[PDB]
């Protein structure tokens, strides 16, 4: 394999996590290429929600029918109070008050994963700062492959 994408997924999530002042932030990544049957966490920052704490964060099945998937294919960002399509667990995670996320597309211009920010406290910076932090990192992951 060529890693290198994960070196860049680390650097950008650093920026995303701190700039957004989120509690927990993750880069999700789809598999196999262009079929998006599975979703992995390839980098996180912050403290894991209690529902994924001591559990594998990889190889979780993709429900293409949840809102976030379809919304990302329309090309807009997703936020939610209680819907975490990609978070690697079936259990609900009510300790999350808010999630904001944006797709990133690889060099072949295909939905390849998400950059996602999570809040345990119900306060968070504006969605507009969330967008520009998100989009600037999305653009960098897209070039990285």
């Amino acid at each position: 394999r060529t890693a290198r994408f994960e070196s860049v997924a680390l650097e950008q999530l650093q920026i995303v996590h701190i700039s957004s002042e989120a509690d927990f932030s993750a880069v999700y990544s789809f598999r196999p290429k262009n079929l998006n049957y599975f979703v992995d966490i390839i980098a996180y920052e912050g403290k894991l929600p209690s529902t994924i704490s001591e559990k594998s964060l990889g190889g979780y099945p993709v429900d293409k029918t949840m809102d976030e998937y379809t919304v990302h294919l329309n090309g807009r960002h997703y936020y939610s109070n209680s819907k975490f399509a990609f978070l690697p667990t079936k259990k609900p995670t009510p300790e999350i008050n808010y999630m904001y996320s944006c797709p990133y597309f690889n060099l072949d211009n295909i939905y390849a994963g998400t950059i996602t920010m999570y809040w345990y406290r119900n306060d968070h910076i504006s969605n507009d700062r969330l967008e520009s932090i998100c989009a600037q990192a999305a653009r960098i992951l897209g070039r990285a492959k």
Partner: protein
């Protein structure tokens, strides 16, 4: 996507009826499973919606017993 609608039926049925009960999901367990579902399909493709929904189920089910994978 531009996916083989039959493999995607067959694969999604395998995932929702079996693979999502897997107690130990990980990167390479999904890739072994995908590699088996892909090769099985490609050597004897199912030809229809109804045929795929149900060959995907019972073949993922077989895979579970072959490599002896913990469920529920």
């Amino acid at each position: 996507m531009n996916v083989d609608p039959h493999f995607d039926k067959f694969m999604e049925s395998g995932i929702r009826h079996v693979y999502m009960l897997f107690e130990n999901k990980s990167v390479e367990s999904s890739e072994q499973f995908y590699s088996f579902m892909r090769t099985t399909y490609k050597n004897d493709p199912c030809s229809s919606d109804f045929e795929c929904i149900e060959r995907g189920a019972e073949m993922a089910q077989s895979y579970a017993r072959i490599m002896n994978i913990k469920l529920e």
